[PDB]
């Protein structure tokens, strides 16, 4: 356990904005009807605590509703939430730099439906030969998705699963947060 | 109860200094060894809650520790707070234009002593004549002392007296927050 460093440390919220942000992490949370996360920019992926004294709406946080995970220097902040998400543990983190916001991958569709399996590793659309997975399911996610950019492409967040149970060569994160 | 219009308000910290404001608020705290309030321009005292969503710091507050009452609009953060100093519900909030700092009214002195009397209604430096009062003191405040600024002169935090008794013409503030 340790603290992120507050040398280069930016954190602000004016005009319906609240920005979380240092060297590396550039984190956006928006007012449109409620306040949520709506972009992350991660350089590269950190392990540290995100200071109290540069965090907005600290106040009564639940740690499994951090969408970027407190252990991963996700400021413990209620900006750092979205409706029918709960914490990332196993998203994209070692692929290097990995944004996250809320929209589609490209070619894709998302479905709420009881259906659909439980959380699980994060998703690439791709498959190892490049071949596009297209429809995916949530059980109680929103819309529009959790979505992940790496340098090999675009994922979904746990909450979000390949619908299709004949998914054979699926690329999937090995990370535990 | 009520809380605060967001619409013109901007909270932000960086480069060691940490900003609450909006149009009539200007809350400075800055790192110097710890965090602690500076600075606040209150163009015209008001009473509604700050937004926890514009609020940096706000984990596991003592409302008694908030310089700023909260009740007054104070920020739930441990950014509006002094060593030595308790919330303010006495201050001089009914003449207007308030600024708060931590600077010596000229001319005056403070002295830590346990010869001092109780936190009671914030003090004005001059008399109504305009005679100054010079020699100050506090049970167990930290220097540089809580100083008030309004249209009608200098006054002292809660905490800082008079040490003299024969004080007859004190002007003092008959708020209660």
Same mark, same amino acid.
């Given at each position: 356990?340790?603290?992120?460093?507050?040398?280069?440390?930016?954190?602000?919220?004016?005009?319906?904005?609240?920005?979380?942000?240092?060297?590396?992490?550039?984190?956006?949370?928006?007012?449109?009807?409620?306040?949520?996360?709506?972009?992350?920019?991660?350089?590269?992926?950190?392990?540290?605590?995100?200071?109290?004294?540069?965090?907005?709406?600290?106040?009564?946080?639940?740690?499994? *509703?951090?969408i970027?995970?407190? &252990?991963?220097?996700?400021?413990? =902040?209620?900006?750092? @939430?979205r %409706?029918?998400y709960? +914490?990332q543990?196993?998203?994209?983190?070692?692929?290097?730099?990995?944004?996250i916001d809320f *929209?589609?991958?490209?070619?894709? &569709?998302?479905?709420?439906?009881? =259906?659909?399996?439980? @959380?699980? %590793?994060?998703?690439? +659309?791709?498959?190892?030969?490049?071949?596009?997975?297209?429809?995916?399911?949530?059980?109680?996610c929103?819309?529009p998705p959790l979505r992940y950019?790496?340098?090999?492409?675009?994922?979904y967040g746990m909450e979000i699963?390949?619908?299709?149970?004949?998914?054979?060569?699926?690329?999937?994160?090995?990370?535990?947060?």
């Amino acid at each position: 356990t340790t603290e992120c460093d507050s040398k280069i440390m930016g954190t602000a919220v004016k005009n319906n904005l609240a920005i979380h942000s240092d060297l590396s992490y550039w984190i956006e949370s928006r007012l449109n009807d409620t306040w949520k996360l709506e972009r992350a920019v991660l350089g590269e992926v950190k392990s540290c605590t995100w200071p109290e004294t540069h965090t907005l709406w600290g106040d009564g946080i639940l740690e499994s *509703d951090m969408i970027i995970p407190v &252990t991963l220097a996700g400021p413990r =902040s209620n900006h750092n @939430r979205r %409706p029918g998400y709960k +914490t990332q543990n196993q998203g994209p983190w070692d692929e290097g730099r990995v944004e996250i916001d809320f *929209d589609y991958c490209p070619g894709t &569709t998302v479905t709420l439906s009881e =259906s659909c399996g439980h @959380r699980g %590793p994060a998703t690439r +659309t791709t498959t190892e030969s490049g071949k596009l997975i297209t429809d995916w399911c949530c059980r109680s996610c929103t819309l529009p998705p959790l979505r992940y950019q790496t340098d090999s492409g675009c994922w979904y967040g746990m909450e979000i699963r390949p619908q299709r149970h004949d998914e054979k060569t699926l690329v999937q994160s090995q990370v535990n947060a």
